[PDB]
Amino acid sequence: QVQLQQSGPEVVKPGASVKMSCKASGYTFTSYVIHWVRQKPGQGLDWIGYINPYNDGTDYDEKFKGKATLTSDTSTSTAYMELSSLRSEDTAVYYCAREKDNYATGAWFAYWGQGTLVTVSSASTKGPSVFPLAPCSRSTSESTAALGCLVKDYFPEPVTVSWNSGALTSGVHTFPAVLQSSGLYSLSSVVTVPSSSLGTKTYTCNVDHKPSNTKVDKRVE
Amino acid sequence: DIVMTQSPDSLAVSLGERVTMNCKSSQSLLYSTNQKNYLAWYQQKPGQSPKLLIYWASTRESGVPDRFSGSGSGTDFTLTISSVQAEDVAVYYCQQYYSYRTFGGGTKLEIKRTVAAPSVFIFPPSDEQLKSGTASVVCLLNNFYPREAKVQWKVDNALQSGNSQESVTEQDSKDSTYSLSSTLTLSKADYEKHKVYACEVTHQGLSSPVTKSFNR
Amino acid sequence: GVSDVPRDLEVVAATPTSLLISWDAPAVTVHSYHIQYWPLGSYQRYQVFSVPGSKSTATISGLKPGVEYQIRVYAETGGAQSMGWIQIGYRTE
């Protein structure tokens, strides 16, 4: 089981540099080449560079010849990449990957990291308030009923939501966030259950925000 | 660099049908010595990282099911999904490793289903949000296939503009359907003033436009 | 842009005393190719000979076995391009 685990999401002032990490485990860290890919929101993958952990050998793509810097800590078995003079465009998601095998036998990116979201901005990180979304009354003639949570005034993205400690996964829809006019994102999460089952089970949604380190579970009924 | 180009922009395919997705490279990827194409195919389902599908352009990864198959040689390559399952809603990328490592623009594969209407619901604002001073009124549309949906907010029979913020998912993996969330945000004082709230909806599946209303 | 440099220079086959090199011509018409060979490090001991711009190869005789050499080929255009060159290295048996 080869794992690749990157940093969490971050906020970085414009012009400042962001140094992010990628921790490898499950193989000889100095024996395979590491690659970095940038993906902007809902856009294609842009290759950046590749680092050889053995001697910290370095080659980049021209687009990132100035920005991208790849180093590796052999003892901790971690690969880093830092971008310099961040710009508004540079807000994106960056992945770290590995070659399947060595010495040109396997050069395709087979094992992948989860991704790191860097929100290039000068605004302050803020905690999400979680509100319950419930029907006005349980008089619905139709069997299906709707329950939900309302995550409002959170910055920066991402926020992940799970229902009943991640147990409930049928008929759940977590919507992509929207930037409120105020300037903070506002996300809505909902789930479907039958009218007969309200009050039988207790429904609670788990909101987790990484830049703020906030986990608030809201009881909804 | 080697410029990779993927056609089409996005693709709509019906269930059980055959998919063809093309990747053409700037210069050749075929290596004359060992007669191997240095090209690979990747899947990315929403919210996840990319997944390896085909390596050497002719071979698939152990996890990959049997319906996917890689074809082509030289400069013109093609991914073929034998029978589209509902769970293949994803964006597929192609990459070369001959020199450096360049990707494609991507092809979004969307499934085309039978038309189905939305099951619509309205929520009032929670008491907890009202004690803070803000009223938010969310209107939900669930599992409607035609992505085209009209939602209008009427407050005491009055259209509202400029204050609604709407959000839509991508195509569900289980049944290939969509969902929408229109959110009306206003202050507590302005919310108290009016008595009746309702989101009116239109859809290709709804022969008569439908509304759901609540009263404070 | 509009370069005047010989390309894809390599050694086709060799003997402990002689090299035979081949190169690929540039875009422009070339009046003559100048083949300059010297031992590694010591530029002072070079010997250079000229071949006509239509000839693609040249033999290099009189070499010492087991010696690193440096080989440089220029291209001169008569129009007033410049003296461009591609350079490799090699070792005799």
Added chain:
Amino acid sequence: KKVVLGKKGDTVELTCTASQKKSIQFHWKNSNQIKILGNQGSFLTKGPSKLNDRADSRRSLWDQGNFPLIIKNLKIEDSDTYICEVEDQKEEVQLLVFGLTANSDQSLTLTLESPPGSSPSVQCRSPRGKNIQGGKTLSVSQLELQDSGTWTCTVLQNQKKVEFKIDIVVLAFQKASSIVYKKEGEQVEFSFPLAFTVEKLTGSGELWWQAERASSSKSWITFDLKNKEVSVKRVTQDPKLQMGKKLPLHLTLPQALPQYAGSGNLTLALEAKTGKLHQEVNLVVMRATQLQKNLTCEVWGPTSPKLMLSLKLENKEAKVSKREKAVWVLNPEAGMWQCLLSDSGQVLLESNIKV
């Protein structure tokens, strides 16, 4: 199994052996399962591959049980996976061949010829020791006359490396400048390598210099060049200059002194084209020494204002540093101090002194 890297055009031998120390049937095939060569009894049967000319084997070792595959004049396209096949089991050896070549658009360019799918990183060290690291292509943007020796580039793929050596020659009268930094008392060497086009051609030249005092421009020597023969027309008594009779335009100063410092112009004209060729040369001189209890380190000549002088013990940190032309310390701590004139990244001149 095995992994071998090679120099383009060089010769490598792929070792295969068997358990039985006798002559037995075997053959070689590449990644595409194509016959490279086989044996039929005593005879050696050639394979159908495009490697037919260069691939070969040594029949001397067949009795001893070794079955090597020899490839001479390696090409990058040769890099592939090869398989030794005796009828019982197969041994596999993967081969990568690199190459290094130098283009020129003053300025120089290096391209690393690489096999497909490789992920190589290449660092390169100058003759003076300056390291230039890069990917598949390196660019030598700015060159000075001093740094014109044999450069060494070491190429690394994963854990295996290969060394390349190539010469760089910087032309004198091109836009590249010459500069030499010397501690007081050392002999000074200037070289002006000539282009191969004009080296046979004939002309005349001389060298003008300016000292610490700008009152006068001395004009050290006048010299004549005919055939490939350098003869001197006039020399000043003050620097005991030596002009090489030999063709490489070589000029030596007997010992570096502070008065012998400053910018200079070397002008060569030629009866053929009658177009004045010029070349810019600088000499910077350091004096770092102790008089009784005083320690003084001064530098003379045309130095860019940006560089900085420092006095420092090699154990501790800089006891004094200014960007000026002179530095002085009184009653310094006991130890082996050092005076440095340096830019931001590297130290141009270092002098070691004992207090």
